[PDB]
A = this chain, B = another copy of it.
Amino acid sequence: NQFIKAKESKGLTYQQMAQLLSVNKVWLTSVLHGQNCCDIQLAHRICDTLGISHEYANELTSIPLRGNQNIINDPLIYRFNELFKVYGSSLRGIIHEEFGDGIMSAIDCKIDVTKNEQSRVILRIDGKFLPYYKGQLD
Contact = CB atoms under 8 A, between A and B. Distances in A.
A85 interface: yes
Say which size band chain A's interface belongs to. Answer: 35 or more
Nearest to A90: B29
Contacts of A33: 89-90, 93
A102 interface: yes
A104 B79 contact: yes
A38 B96 contact: no
Interface of A: 4, 13-15, 22-31, 33, 35-39, 42, 63, 65-71, 73-99, 101-111, 113, 115-116, 119-138
Nearest to A12: B97
B125 A94 contact: no
Contacts of A121: 95, 99, 104, 125-129
B13 A97 contact: yes
A88 B71 CA distance: 8
